[PDB]
Amino acid sequence: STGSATTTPIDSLDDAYITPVQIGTPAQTLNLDFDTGSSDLWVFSSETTASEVDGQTIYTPSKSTTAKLLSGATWSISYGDGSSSSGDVYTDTVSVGGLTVTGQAVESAKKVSSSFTEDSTIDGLLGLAFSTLNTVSPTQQKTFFDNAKASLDSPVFTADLGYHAPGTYNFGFIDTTAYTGSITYTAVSTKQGFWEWTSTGYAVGSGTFKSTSIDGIADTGTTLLYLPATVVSAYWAQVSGAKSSSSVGGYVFPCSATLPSFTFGVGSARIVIPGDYIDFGPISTGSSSCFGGIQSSAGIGINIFGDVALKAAFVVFNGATTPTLGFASK
C-alpha cells in the first residue's frame, strides 16, 4: 500500500504545516501537524476542556463506530517549546492520503496548553519519530508509520515541504519526479528516539564550505533551524545590522536586509536554503526588526533541522531495519 497527502502552511510565514487526517467511522477529518520529532498522535476532542478549545476541529469518539476506549491508558507530553497536552486514549481507524491503519492509538486531549488553544489551525499532532518516545502509559503505543510499515510497498515516508506553498507527505514510495539529482542517504541514530543524523558542514552565502560534523535531528514539527552558536554567529555576521536580542529571544535583523543563503552538507552533497526561507517577518506587527530563521541551539541541548532546512529538500525517512535519512535538492 501507499498514501499521499498534501501538507499546507498554517500561515504566511510557514510557522507550521497541517495535513488532513481521517479518523473514525464515518470519517472525522482533522488537520494535524506531522511531527518527525515526537511519537504521539493526539487530537483535540469532545473531551478537551471547553475553555481550551478555540476554533479547532474536534474528534468525537462516541460518534465513531470503530472507536474503542483503550482501558486504563493515559498520555501526557511536553514539547521542546514548553507547550503540553494530556488525556486518555482510543483505538480507531486512521487514514492519511488513502493509507489506512486500523487499531491506531488516537490520544484524545483532556487538557492542552495555551499555545495549542491559541492556534485554531492545528487540530492535533501526528508523531513520526520512533515509537520508543510514545508517552502512552502503562502500555506504550506505536506511531501511525510503525503500524503501517509492514503493509507499505517500501518502509519509508517522505517529506516535501513547500516554501510559502503546499507540499506533500508520501508513505510507502519515493516519487522520483519530486526532486532533482540524486538522493544522498546518511546514517541515523535512534538512541534518543529521533531521526538523528550528522551533517558534514555548512556554508554561508557564496562563502567557502566548512567541513565540520553537526549532529542534529530532522524535525518537521519545529519551524526553525537551530544550530551551534558558532555557526549561527557566522551566518548573521553576513547580515548588516543583525544582532542577537535577549529581549526578543534570538537573532533579529533589519527587515530591509537581503539575507544570504545557507548551505548544509549531507555526505558529499549540499542542500541550499535560499535567504528568503530564513525571513520570519516582523518581530511584532509594524516593526522594522525581523526574526531570523536560523537560531542558536545552545539552550536546547540538540541541534534541530526544522522546517527552514527541510523545506529546501526532498527528505526520505527510511524506516528499514536499520533506518537512514535521505536528502535531495528539488
mmCIF file of C-alpha atoms in Angstrom:
data_model
loop_
_atom_site.group_PDB
_atom_site.id
_atom_site.type_symbol
_atom_site.label_atom_id
_atom_site.label_comp_id
_atom_site.label_asym_id
_atom_site.label_seq_id
_atom_site.Cartn_x
_atom_site.Cartn_y
_atom_site.Cartn_z
ATOM 1 C CA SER A 1 0.000 0.000 0.000
ATOM 2 C CA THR A 2 0.851 3.679 -0.241
ATOM 3 C CA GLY A 3 -0.553 7.011 0.828
ATOM 4 C CA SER A 4 -0.076 10.589 -0.339
ATOM 5 C CA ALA A 5 -1.393 13.734 1.352
ATOM 6 C CA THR A 6 -0.900 17.434 0.762
ATOM 7 C CA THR A 7 0.533 19.465 3.632
ATOM 8 C CA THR A 8 -0.274 23.175 3.809
ATOM 9 C CA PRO A 9 1.362 26.042 5.750
ATOM 10 C CA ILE A 10 -0.843 27.362 8.539
ATOM 11 C CA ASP A 11 0.073 30.997 7.853
ATOM 12 C CA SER A 12 2.079 33.281 5.571
ATOM 13 C CA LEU A 13 5.332 32.558 7.446
ATOM 14 C CA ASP A 14 5.242 28.745 7.218
ATOM 15 C CA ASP A 15 5.133 28.577 11.020
ATOM 16 C CA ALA A 16 3.859 25.000 10.754
ATOM 17 C CA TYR A 17 2.207 22.693 8.250
ATOM 18 C CA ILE A 18 -1.118 20.870 8.550
ATOM 19 C CA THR A 19 -2.154 17.664 6.805
ATOM 20 C CA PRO A 20 -5.727 16.311 6.724
ATOM 21 C CA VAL A 21 -6.214 13.005 8.534
ATOM 22 C CA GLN A 22 -9.349 10.843 8.567
ATOM 23 C CA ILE A 23 -10.199 9.376 11.974
ATOM 24 C CA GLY A 24 -13.045 7.013 12.761
ATOM 25 C CA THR A 25 -16.150 5.723 11.031
ATOM 26 C CA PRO A 26 -17.697 7.730 9.476
ATOM 27 C CA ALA A 27 -14.513 9.674 8.945
ATOM 28 C CA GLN A 28 -13.836 12.769 11.024
ATOM 29 C CA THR A 29 -11.220 14.830 9.209
ATOM 30 C CA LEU A 30 -8.795 16.739 11.432
ATOM 31 C CA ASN A 31 -5.823 18.824 10.284
ATOM 32 C CA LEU A 32 -2.775 17.511 12.121
ATOM 33 C CA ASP A 33 0.796 18.743 12.434
ATOM 34 C CA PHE A 34 3.004 15.879 11.229
ATOM 35 C CA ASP A 35 5.945 15.891 13.633
ATOM 36 C CA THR A 36 9.032 13.771 12.986
ATOM 37 C CA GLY A 37 10.323 14.916 16.393
ATOM 38 C CA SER A 38 7.637 13.216 18.516
ATOM 39 C CA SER A 39 5.721 9.956 18.608
ATOM 40 C CA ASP A 40 2.161 10.641 19.799
ATOM 41 C CA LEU A 41 -0.913 11.036 17.607
ATOM 42 C CA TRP A 42 -3.090 13.308 19.723
ATOM 43 C CA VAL A 43 -6.178 15.333 18.886
ATOM 44 C CA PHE A 44 -8.476 17.986 20.198
ATOM 45 C CA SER A 45 -11.621 16.130 21.151
ATOM 46 C CA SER A 46 -15.078 16.212 22.692
ATOM 47 C CA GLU A 47 -13.200 15.536 25.960
ATOM 48 C CA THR A 48 -10.992 18.638 25.768
ATOM 49 C CA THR A 49 -11.715 21.215 28.471
ATOM 50 C CA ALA A 50 -14.170 23.534 26.746
ATOM 51 C CA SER A 51 -12.320 26.751 27.638
ATOM 52 C CA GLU A 52 -9.189 25.322 25.977
ATOM 53 C CA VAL A 53 -10.864 24.830 22.576
ATOM 54 C CA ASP A 54 -10.926 27.941 20.379
ATOM 55 C CA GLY A 55 -11.801 27.093 16.771
ATOM 56 C CA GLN A 56 -10.167 23.675 16.381
ATOM 57 C CA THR A 57 -11.985 20.756 14.838
ATOM 58 C CA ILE A 58 -12.548 18.049 17.440
ATOM 59 C CA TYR A 59 -12.620 14.259 17.346
ATOM 60 C CA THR A 60 -15.757 12.846 18.984
ATOM 61 C CA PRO A 61 -15.115 9.147 19.660
ATOM 62 C CA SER A 62 -18.725 8.464 20.658
ATOM 63 C CA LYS A 63 -19.706 9.236 17.035
ATOM 64 C CA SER A 64 -17.205 6.729 15.606
ATOM 65 C CA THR A 65 -18.470 3.166 15.375
ATOM 66 C CA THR A 66 -14.890 1.850 15.253
ATOM 67 C CA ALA A 67 -13.572 3.771 18.270
ATOM 68 C CA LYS A 68 -12.723 1.763 21.383
ATOM 69 C CA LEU A 69 -11.504 3.187 24.677
ATOM 70 C CA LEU A 70 -8.053 1.799 25.473
ATOM 71 C CA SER A 71 -8.795 0.847 29.044
ATOM 72 C CA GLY A 72 -6.576 2.472 31.637
ATOM 73 C CA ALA A 73 -4.361 4.263 29.132
ATOM 74 C CA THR A 74 -3.338 7.879 29.617
ATOM 75 C CA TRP A 75 -0.832 10.153 27.935
ATOM 76 C CA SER A 76 0.967 13.386 28.717
ATOM 77 C CA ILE A 77 3.539 15.189 26.606
ATOM 78 C CA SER A 78 5.708 18.280 26.897
ATOM 79 C CA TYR A 79 7.390 19.697 23.814
ATOM 80 C CA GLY A 80 10.713 21.494 23.461
ATOM 81 C CA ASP A 81 8.921 24.851 23.194
ATOM 82 C CA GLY A 82 7.209 24.494 26.585
ATOM 83 C CA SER A 83 3.778 23.512 25.259
ATOM 84 C CA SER A 84 1.996 20.407 26.515
ATOM 85 C CA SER A 85 -1.154 18.295 26.389
ATOM 86 C CA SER A 86 -2.578 15.192 28.081
ATOM 87 C CA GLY A 87 -5.601 12.913 28.117
ATOM 88 C CA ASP A 88 -6.912 9.392 27.515
ATOM 89 C CA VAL A 89 -6.631 7.018 24.566
ATOM 90 C CA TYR A 90 -8.862 5.366 21.996
ATOM 91 C CA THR A 91 -8.035 2.995 19.214
ATOM 92 C CA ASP A 92 -9.672 3.794 15.891
ATOM 93 C CA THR A 93 -9.189 3.660 12.144
ATOM 94 C CA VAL A 94 -6.865 6.383 10.855
ATOM 95 C CA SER A 95 -6.249 7.167 7.197
ATOM 96 C CA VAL A 96 -3.702 9.525 5.643
ATOM 97 C CA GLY A 97 -3.838 10.191 1.944
ATOM 98 C CA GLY A 98 -5.540 6.870 1.223
ATOM 99 C CA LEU A 99 -3.360 4.754 3.551
ATOM 100 C CA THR A 100 -5.429 3.172 6.333
ATOM 101 C CA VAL A 101 -4.340 1.812 9.717
ATOM 102 C CA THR A 102 -6.855 0.004 11.889
ATOM 103 C CA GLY A 103 -6.400 -0.003 15.644
ATOM 104 C CA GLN A 104 -4.289 3.153 15.707
ATOM 105 C CA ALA A 105 -3.889 4.752 19.120
ATOM 106 C CA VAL A 106 -5.643 8.117 18.960
ATOM 107 C CA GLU A 107 -4.743 10.137 22.037
ATOM 108 C CA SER A 108 -7.707 12.313 22.999
ATOM 109 C CA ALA A 109 -6.789 15.551 24.757
ATOM 110 C CA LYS A 110 -8.460 16.424 28.020
ATOM 111 C CA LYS A 111 -6.033 19.330 28.562
ATOM 112 C CA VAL A 112 -3.905 21.401 26.182
ATOM 113 C CA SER A 113 -1.582 24.300 26.926
ATOM 114 C CA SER A 114 -2.431 27.835 25.898
ATOM 115 C CA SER A 115 -0.225 27.806 22.799
ATOM 116 C CA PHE A 116 -2.339 24.997 21.336
ATOM 117 C CA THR A 117 -5.620 26.685 22.290
ATOM 118 C CA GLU A 118 -4.447 29.888 20.628
ATOM 119 C CA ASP A 119 -3.632 28.156 17.328
ATOM 120 C CA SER A 120 -7.012 27.488 15.767
ATOM 121 C CA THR A 121 -5.465 25.873 12.664
ATOM 122 C CA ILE A 122 -3.844 22.844 14.352
ATOM 123 C CA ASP A 123 -6.245 20.109 15.485
ATOM 124 C CA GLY A 124 -3.510 17.901 16.943
ATOM 125 C CA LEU A 125 -0.201 16.249 16.155
ATOM 126 C CA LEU A 126 0.749 13.089 14.291
ATOM 127 C CA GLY A 127 4.104 11.897 15.575
ATOM 128 C CA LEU A 128 6.570 10.301 13.165
ATOM 129 C CA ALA A 129 9.635 9.814 15.382
ATOM 130 C CA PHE A 130 10.392 6.371 16.806
ATOM 131 C CA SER A 131 7.756 4.658 18.912
ATOM 132 C CA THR A 132 10.147 4.470 21.889
ATOM 133 C CA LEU A 133 9.190 8.123 22.563
ATOM 134 C CA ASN A 134 5.421 7.478 22.695
ATOM 135 C CA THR A 135 4.044 8.689 26.035
ATOM 136 C CA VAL A 136 1.048 6.367 26.485
ATOM 137 C CA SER A 137 1.059 4.654 29.869
ATOM 138 C CA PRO A 138 1.044 1.928 31.066
ATOM 139 C CA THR A 139 1.322 0.368 27.583
ATOM 140 C CA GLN A 140 3.319 2.387 25.072
ATOM 141 C CA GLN A 141 1.666 2.678 21.663
ATOM 142 C CA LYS A 142 3.012 2.654 18.108
ATOM 143 C CA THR A 143 3.098 5.549 15.683
ATOM 144 C CA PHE A 144 0.982 5.622 12.550
ATOM 145 C CA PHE A 145 4.075 4.875 10.462
ATOM 146 C CA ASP A 146 5.138 1.980 12.684
ATOM 147 C CA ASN A 147 1.659 0.457 12.376
ATOM 148 C CA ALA A 148 1.564 0.962 8.597
ATOM 149 C CA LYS A 149 5.153 -0.015 7.821
ATOM 150 C CA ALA A 150 4.738 -3.726 7.146
ATOM 151 C CA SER A 151 1.875 -3.067 4.699
ATOM 152 C CA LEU A 152 3.674 -0.347 2.739
ATOM 153 C CA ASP A 153 5.266 -1.081 -0.621
ATOM 154 C CA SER A 154 8.534 0.166 0.891
ATOM 155 C CA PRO A 155 9.046 1.026 4.609
ATOM 156 C CA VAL A 156 9.543 4.741 4.039
ATOM 157 C CA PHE A 157 7.830 8.083 4.193
ATOM 158 C CA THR A 158 8.913 11.316 2.542
ATOM 159 C CA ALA A 159 8.520 14.968 3.461
ATOM 160 C CA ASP A 160 8.383 17.562 0.675
ATOM 161 C CA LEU A 161 7.514 20.797 2.445
ATOM 162 C CA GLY A 162 6.832 23.923 0.411
ATOM 163 C CA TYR A 163 8.152 27.441 0.860
ATOM 164 C CA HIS A 164 5.060 29.628 1.167
ATOM 165 C CA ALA A 165 3.182 26.882 -0.677
ATOM 166 C CA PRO A 166 1.688 23.416 -0.150
ATOM 167 C CA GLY A 167 3.812 20.288 -0.206
ATOM 168 C CA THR A 168 3.419 16.542 0.208
ATOM 169 C CA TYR A 169 3.846 13.691 2.668
ATOM 170 C CA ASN A 170 4.096 10.317 0.918
ATOM 171 C CA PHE A 171 4.029 6.915 2.593
ATOM 172 C CA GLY A 172 5.412 3.745 1.076
ATOM 173 C CA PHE A 173 7.076 5.084 -2.071
ATOM 174 C CA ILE A 174 9.590 7.624 -3.363
ATOM 175 C CA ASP A 175 8.217 9.988 -6.026
ATOM 176 C CA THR A 176 11.196 10.228 -8.364
ATOM 177 C CA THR A 177 9.615 13.249 -10.096
ATOM 178 C CA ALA A 178 9.626 15.310 -6.874
ATOM 179 C CA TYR A 179 13.366 16.068 -6.674
ATOM 180 C CA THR A 180 16.371 16.877 -8.836
ATOM 181 C CA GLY A 181 19.627 14.962 -8.986
ATOM 182 C CA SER A 182 20.090 12.039 -6.618
ATOM 183 C CA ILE A 183 19.072 11.333 -3.044
ATOM 184 C CA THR A 184 22.044 11.141 -0.673
ATOM 185 C CA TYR A 185 21.445 8.845 2.277
ATOM 186 C CA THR A 186 23.080 9.275 5.655
ATOM 187 C CA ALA A 187 23.217 7.246 8.856
ATOM 188 C CA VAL A 188 20.638 7.646 11.624
ATOM 189 C CA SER A 189 20.996 7.058 15.354
ATOM 190 C CA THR A 190 17.729 6.066 17.035
ATOM 191 C CA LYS A 191 19.270 6.121 20.523
ATOM 192 C CA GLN A 192 17.314 9.231 21.554
ATOM 193 C CA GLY A 193 14.183 8.205 19.629
ATOM 194 C CA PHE A 194 14.721 10.841 16.914
ATOM 195 C CA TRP A 195 15.746 10.862 13.265
ATOM 196 C CA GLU A 196 19.204 11.912 14.410
ATOM 197 C CA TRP A 197 21.985 12.297 11.857
ATOM 198 C CA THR A 198 25.261 14.134 11.310
ATOM 199 C CA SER A 199 25.594 16.907 8.757
ATOM 200 C CA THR A 200 29.029 17.248 7.176
ATOM 201 C CA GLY A 201 29.232 21.054 7.391
ATOM 202 C CA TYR A 202 27.917 24.350 6.141
ATOM 203 C CA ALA A 203 28.453 27.442 4.041
ATOM 204 C CA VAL A 204 27.091 30.975 4.340
ATOM 205 C CA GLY A 205 26.054 32.553 1.049
ATOM 206 C CA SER A 206 28.765 32.157 -1.562
ATOM 207 C CA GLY A 207 31.391 31.527 1.121
ATOM 208 C CA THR A 208 33.637 28.514 1.423
ATOM 209 C CA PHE A 209 32.184 25.288 2.763
ATOM 210 C CA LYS A 210 33.297 24.496 6.315
ATOM 211 C CA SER A 211 33.669 20.757 6.840
ATOM 212 C CA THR A 212 32.530 20.016 10.384
ATOM 213 C CA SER A 213 30.259 17.395 11.937
ATOM 214 C CA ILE A 214 26.915 18.754 13.143
ATOM 215 C CA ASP A 215 24.763 16.172 14.918
ATOM 216 C CA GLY A 216 21.093 17.037 14.887
ATOM 217 C CA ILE A 217 17.562 15.829 14.279
ATOM 218 C CA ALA A 218 15.314 16.069 11.232
ATOM 219 C CA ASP A 219 12.195 17.596 12.814
ATOM 220 C CA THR A 220 9.197 18.581 10.703
ATOM 221 C CA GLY A 221 7.436 19.802 13.844
ATOM 222 C CA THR A 222 9.993 22.553 14.543
ATOM 223 C CA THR A 223 9.718 25.742 12.486
ATOM 224 C CA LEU A 224 13.303 26.980 12.527
ATOM 225 C CA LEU A 225 16.861 25.754 12.016
ATOM 226 C CA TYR A 226 18.704 25.518 15.363
ATOM 227 C CA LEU A 227 22.478 25.131 15.071
ATOM 228 C CA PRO A 228 25.578 25.668 17.219
ATOM 229 C CA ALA A 229 26.265 29.234 18.275
ATOM 230 C CA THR A 230 29.477 29.385 16.226
ATOM 231 C CA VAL A 231 27.621 28.500 13.017
ATOM 232 C CA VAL A 232 24.731 30.860 13.709
ATOM 233 C CA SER A 233 27.069 33.751 14.542
ATOM 234 C CA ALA A 234 28.903 33.171 11.256
ATOM 235 C CA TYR A 235 25.604 33.342 9.364
ATOM 236 C CA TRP A 236 24.250 36.523 10.948
ATOM 237 C CA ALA A 237 27.625 38.281 10.684
ATOM 238 C CA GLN A 238 26.876 38.437 6.944
ATOM 239 C CA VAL A 239 23.673 40.460 7.524
ATOM 240 C CA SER A 240 24.289 44.142 8.199
ATOM 241 C CA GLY A 241 22.588 45.212 11.392
ATOM 242 C CA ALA A 242 21.679 41.719 12.569
ATOM 243 C CA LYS A 243 22.113 41.055 16.273
ATOM 244 C CA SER A 244 21.138 38.601 18.955
ATOM 245 C CA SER A 245 18.408 40.174 21.071
ATOM 246 C CA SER A 246 17.989 38.794 24.581
ATOM 247 C CA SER A 247 14.615 40.530 24.902
ATOM 248 C CA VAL A 248 13.231 39.089 21.671
ATOM 249 C CA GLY A 249 14.824 35.684 22.247
ATOM 250 C CA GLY A 250 17.170 35.289 19.305
ATOM 251 C CA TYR A 251 18.717 36.842 16.243
ATOM 252 C CA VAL A 252 16.823 39.689 14.617
ATOM 253 C CA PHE A 253 17.733 41.651 11.523
ATOM 254 C CA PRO A 254 16.572 44.764 9.676
ATOM 255 C CA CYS A 255 13.563 43.946 7.571
ATOM 256 C CA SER A 256 15.246 45.890 4.721
ATOM 257 C CA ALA A 257 18.136 43.399 4.577
ATOM 258 C CA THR A 258 18.742 40.850 1.836
ATOM 259 C CA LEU A 259 19.535 37.537 3.524
ATOM 260 C CA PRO A 260 22.272 35.218 2.244
ATOM 261 C CA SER A 261 21.600 31.570 1.580
ATOM 262 C CA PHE A 262 22.734 28.854 3.981
ATOM 263 C CA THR A 263 24.105 25.520 2.753
ATOM 264 C CA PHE A 264 24.268 22.334 4.812
ATOM 265 C CA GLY A 265 26.121 19.151 3.949
ATOM 266 C CA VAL A 266 24.658 15.670 3.614
ATOM 267 C CA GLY A 267 27.657 13.473 2.977
ATOM 268 C CA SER A 268 29.325 14.987 -0.074
ATOM 269 C CA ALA A 269 26.018 16.540 -1.195
ATOM 270 C CA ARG A 270 24.869 20.066 -0.424
ATOM 271 C CA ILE A 271 21.389 21.439 0.322
ATOM 272 C CA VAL A 272 20.999 25.179 -0.258
ATOM 273 C CA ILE A 273 18.461 27.101 1.839
ATOM 274 C CA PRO A 274 17.639 30.340 -0.036
ATOM 275 C CA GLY A 275 17.957 33.506 2.008
ATOM 276 C CA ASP A 276 14.266 34.286 1.881
ATOM 277 C CA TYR A 277 13.493 30.995 3.661
ATOM 278 C CA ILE A 278 15.290 32.493 6.673
ATOM 279 C CA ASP A 279 12.983 35.537 6.975
ATOM 280 C CA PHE A 280 10.277 35.141 9.633
ATOM 281 C CA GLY A 281 8.993 38.684 9.363
ATOM 282 C CA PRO A 282 8.479 41.497 11.834
ATOM 283 C CA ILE A 283 9.004 40.660 15.491
ATOM 284 C CA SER A 284 5.712 42.448 16.228
ATOM 285 C CA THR A 285 3.168 43.951 13.892
ATOM 286 C CA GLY A 286 4.550 47.037 12.187
ATOM 287 C CA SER A 287 8.123 46.593 13.403
ATOM 288 C CA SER A 288 11.066 47.014 11.044
ATOM 289 C CA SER A 289 13.013 44.381 13.011
ATOM 290 C CA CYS A 290 12.550 40.879 11.605
ATOM 291 C CA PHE A 291 13.006 37.494 13.257
ATOM 292 C CA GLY A 292 15.654 35.159 11.908
ATOM 293 C CA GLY A 293 15.027 31.603 10.785
ATOM 294 C CA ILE A 294 18.447 30.326 11.880
ATOM 295 C CA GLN A 295 18.867 30.426 15.659
ATOM 296 C CA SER A 296 21.271 29.061 18.237
ATOM 297 C CA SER A 297 20.668 25.624 19.720
ATOM 298 C CA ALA A 298 22.852 26.447 22.715
ATOM 299 C CA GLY A 299 19.882 26.483 25.103
ATOM 300 C CA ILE A 300 18.230 23.349 23.664
ATOM 301 C CA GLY A 301 20.788 20.571 24.073
ATOM 302 C CA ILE A 302 20.401 19.338 20.488
ATOM 303 C CA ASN A 303 20.670 20.790 17.007
ATOM 304 C CA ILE A 304 17.392 20.792 15.083
ATOM 305 C CA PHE A 305 16.998 20.689 11.305
ATOM 306 C CA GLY A 306 13.479 22.065 11.361
ATOM 307 C CA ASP A 307 11.233 23.252 8.572
ATOM 308 C CA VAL A 308 13.597 26.050 7.416
ATOM 309 C CA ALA A 309 16.119 23.364 6.458
ATOM 310 C CA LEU A 310 13.780 20.540 5.494
ATOM 311 C CA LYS A 311 11.657 22.640 3.111
ATOM 312 C CA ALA A 312 14.769 23.190 0.959
ATOM 313 C CA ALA A 313 14.953 19.423 0.335
ATOM 314 C CA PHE A 314 13.067 16.289 -0.556
ATOM 315 C CA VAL A 315 13.576 14.203 2.583
ATOM 316 C CA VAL A 316 13.326 10.416 2.850
ATOM 317 C CA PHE A 317 12.637 8.890 6.265
ATOM 318 C CA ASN A 318 13.735 5.316 5.615
ATOM 319 C CA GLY A 319 12.293 3.012 8.279
ATOM 320 C CA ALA A 320 14.085 -0.139 7.200
ATOM 321 C CA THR A 321 15.545 -2.398 9.885
ATOM 322 C CA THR A 322 18.498 -0.005 10.024
ATOM 323 C CA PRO A 323 16.883 3.406 9.476
ATOM 324 C CA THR A 324 18.535 6.051 7.320
ATOM 325 C CA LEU A 325 17.694 9.550 6.102
ATOM 326 C CA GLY A 326 17.890 10.730 2.517
ATOM 327 C CA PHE A 327 18.104 14.273 1.186
ATOM 328 C CA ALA A 328 17.756 15.561 -2.367
ATOM 329 C CA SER A 329 17.617 19.033 -3.816
ATOM 330 C CA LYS A 330 14.383 19.960 -5.553
#
